[PDB]
Design a protein around this nucleic acid. Sequence first.
DNA 1: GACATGATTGCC
DNA 2: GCAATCATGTCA
Length: 200
Amino acid sequence: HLTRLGLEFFDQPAVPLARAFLGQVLVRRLPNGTELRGRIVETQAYLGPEDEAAHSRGGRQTPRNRGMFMKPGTLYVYIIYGMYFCMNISSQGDGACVLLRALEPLEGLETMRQLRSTVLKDRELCSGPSKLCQALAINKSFDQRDLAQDEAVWLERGPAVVAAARVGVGHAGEWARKPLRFYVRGSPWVSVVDRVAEQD
DNA sequence: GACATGATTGCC
DNA sequence: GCAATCATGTCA
Ligand code: NA
């Protein structure tokens, strides 16, 4: 409640938003009233129509990815490999959004451990875009919900950033190389480290 | 309607 | 190194 980041926070372009997300806390309120909490430590930006690595490239817009084209803070959750979910948050700009890739589990660990069993060390709980969705019971029903106005999920105010190439982009093209992935330097909770990028 | 494919994960 | 597994994007 009271701590929830509002509409204003999300209304920022993809890069600033993705960097702004680091440190913030994603909260998931379960039916039992329990709340799962994770500190965002890795995010990845998609800039829209011009971004050849995005679902929205070339203005591609369908009922599936409509979330990216809706008001900032709107979620875009999709199924990948017909088996996993990926959670994205719309940012300022049509077709622009930010993908959450890893969280530092803070509360509800045991429930997360159960959710990701279908014994896992804490490091394997939310160290991935699909892992975190699983650990927080996030699925397709969350698609197009508003992070600023939803009863089951929201972001709470925070309390060195590394900019690196994105994960899952392939090895061809200018867009695959851009430093559009951001994570907390030194965090053992990040999904994929880039030692080279870490060398400033 | 048909057909190729995935912003992953995890076992071989 | 590679299979799992199916809704979506495209073409028809
Ligand atoms: Na957007």
